[PDB]
């Protein structure tokens with residue numbers, strides 16, 4: 001963090017929060033790990049030091065230039081911004097895992113309880129802005145620089161990791177990207193409506209697809225919005241979807257060839273690739289190994 | 290807010306649904322408030338009778354469809370009656386004068 | 387004519403005002419019906435009342451959705467004749483099974499039955515007797531060649547296959563039939579089943595009979611198929627037996643009502659001809675309305691039919707009070723039985 005964010009570029013007030021980040025996430029992580037215990041149900045709850053890596057991975061994917069541009073763009077002090085980014089990435093790692101809505105509201109307490117005490121200098125300006133109810137979400141695709149006039153003629157949109165203040169401002173952008181997917185992929189239509197909770201799930205997926213060396217696992221009862229939001233996130237993210245075709249002829253040998261085509265696309269030539277799986281696509285347990 | 294937001298898009302797609310714009314906004318909320326009320330009873334039914342009924346977001350998309358199919362059909366019967374009535378009420382009124 | 391026509395107008399008016407009022411009330415009426423069909427199936431008789439009459443009806447009045455205050459489900463969704471037909475098929479007279487009957491006809495998703503004793507099965511066997519065949523139509527979930535022998539044949543032909551002994555857990559190869567996802571080429575409607583396309587006709591039907599009291603289905607399964615609890619309850623047999631006692635004891639009273647209602651539904655239809663006949667013939671006739679004796683006759687004849695119907699629908703309402711008093715007096719025999 002001290003290497004990636006240098007004193008030279010930042011204010012003295014911003015950099016006092018950057019030094020706080022590294023001490024803050026640990027205080028939070030100890031509180032969250034002590035309270036949310038693994039059980040027969042809610043087995044995944046156990047928090048490792050992968051879940052520390054993953055917080056910081058998110059924080060360091062927000063560039064020095066978007067933090068310094070928070071007073072113009074987000075219309076908040078850049079030192080204040082930085083706490084919102086922290087709060088977001090802390091939530092996305094820790095709070096998203098959590099299976100029920102009561103366990104979330106406990107953890108949103110710990111993320112606020114820590115953010116006040118770690119960031120004492122901006123305590124009164126954090127406390128008033130940042131709630132669990134109020135949204136301050138992050139996405140690479142916020143920028144509408146992709147006009148899409150006879151394909152992508154106007155360069156591309158720089159995929160910079162920026163904060164969105166309201167879900168309504170995002171919905172206009174996310175509804176536009178949905179309508180454009182249905183144009184580009186006309187054979188497989190995707191009639192979908194982006195309610196506040198689905199938008200939130202799309203960002204969460206289009207974060208996990210956008211971070212390097214970051215797989216996902218979308219756990220939902222079924223018909224929950226998983227596959228549809230994934231293919232949209234993969235479309236928005238300008239990366240190649242791959243899905244296993246289940247036929248009686250197709251076996252564990254043909255999987256290995258479908259994975260090999262994945263590495264032929266990913267490791268060779270250098271294309272981002274987003275191998276998609278479901279309960280249905282897992283014909284036998286050996287495929288999942 | 291999700292179920293009501295899904296119910297909002299479905300009523301807009303529904304062109305043959307003829308009612309007040311106020312009433313449609315009350316219906317949107319009701320459609321959603323139904324799908325919660327079933328989940329609330331599904332939990333109650335497991336505590337009182339030890340029977341597990343599972344309702345998913347797919348089972349809400351089924352309700353909304355099923356709603357239109359029975360409405361469209363039931364409106365088609367009613368609307369063609371009211372039109373066979375209304376042809377009457379004009380010609381008879383003229384005959385009375 | 388002025389006395390007669392104003393009379394004929396006021397019969398038309400009042401019906402149109404009721405049909406107009408019925409369209410205003412339809413938005414709620416359909417919401418309260420279609421909620422019951424999709425969700426209330428898997429619950430017992432007690433909880434279907436709780437989930438519909440105590441929960442949904444309360445929500446409507448608060449929201450201000452226009453709904454008929456009573457809204458008897460059985461009356462609204464299906465005619466009184468078709469209830470009579472299901473009774474002959476062997477769907478019992480009790481309120482729960484009638485509703486279970488309505489859910490099977492109206493559900494877009496393939497109906498699943500919970501019935502531990504095949505009461506729901508014995509009804510869907512007696513009904514659909516034409517489109518069912520005894521041999522090579524009914525199979526169990528697990529068969530050596532379930533797919534190629536039964537399923538493949540019944541789709542191609544369009545015969546109503548009934549899956550036996552589902553035993554809680556459903557096979558994953560069946561999923562794409564239940565989903566009703568169709569890759570349409572012309573009008574064939576080819577549906578892939580474990581990676582093999584099969585010609586599905588529109589006249590194909592599937593019924594899935596669980597033979598367990600309390601089966602724990604998966605949310606994915608419960609969303610694919612409309613679950614209907616067809617289990618015989620003490621409360622349900624009470625309502626069946628109470629029907630059987632009322633058919634035996636005070637038979638003369640109960641039969642005279644069934645004769646009257648059947649002659650009332652006739653005279654509603656008979657009056658719908660004469661008032662129609664006038665409308666058709668009063669446009670065709672045109673000028674000199676005073677001499678038009680063949681029209682004049684029916685305008686006064688509609689009135690005697692409209693007076694007759696009205697006086698049976700008062701006497702019909704009196705006999706429903708009279709029989710419901712006896713239904714309470716003979717309740718103790720049925721609830722004992």
Ligand SMILES: Nc1ncnc2c1ncn2[C@@H]1O[C@H](COP(=O)(O)OP(=O)(O)O)[C@@H](O)[C@H]1O
Nearest residue numbers: 191192193194222223224225226227228229295
């Ligand atoms: N907001 C929504 N509007 C319409 N359909 C939706 C919505 N959310 C989910 N669905 C439905 O979810 C179904 C399954 O897709 P999805 O839920 O993304 O994946 P999965 O099958 O893994 O649950 C689709 O048929 C889609 O119509």
Ligand SMILES: [Mg+2]
Nearest residue numbers: 221222223606
């Ligand atoms: Mg599913």
